[PDB]
Design a protein around this ligand. Sequence first.
Ligand SMILES: NC(=O)[C@H]1CCCN(C(=O)Cc2cccc3nonc23)C1
Ligand SMILES: [Zn+2]
Length: 139
Amino acid sequence: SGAIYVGNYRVVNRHLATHNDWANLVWEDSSRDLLVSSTTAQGCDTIARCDCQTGVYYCSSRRKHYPVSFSKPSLIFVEASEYYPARYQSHLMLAVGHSEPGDCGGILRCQHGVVGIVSTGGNGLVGFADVRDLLWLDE
Ligand SMILES: NC(=O)[C@H]1CCCN(C(=O)Cc2cccc3nonc23)C1
Ligand SMILES: [Zn+2]
């Protein structure tokens, strides 16, 4: 579990979105596992606007933050689940690091701000859904 709160927005993994998220839907993309809903209270998360390939992510399954090197956002194959059929997930970044289902929603950050959230993982790898291209989250 986990979300990004920037201004009047809440960014969550689309497969973990609530009924309230869908009733206050702004934008969603199955191919990226993202859903953005509107909020009444103000959010203060700063979104990074950069091409950083190093950062720190929160791992709930370990109650620890870990430094990582991660790849550039790309289309990566992801296996089937109770949420999606087998497909290519776009805007996805992989890092060598620990993750387990339950870790989705953990924030990845660089010195510039929020880079994205945990969305996939397995076999010593962790995948992050990038949010840096969503320029409209700030305006
Ligand atoms: N974006 C998707 O299609 C997801 C949907 C939920 C299930 N997915 C996983 O990757 C499970 C998983 C296993 C093992 C470490 C994991 N860390 O985070 N998620 C992990 C795929
Ligand atoms: Zn950065």
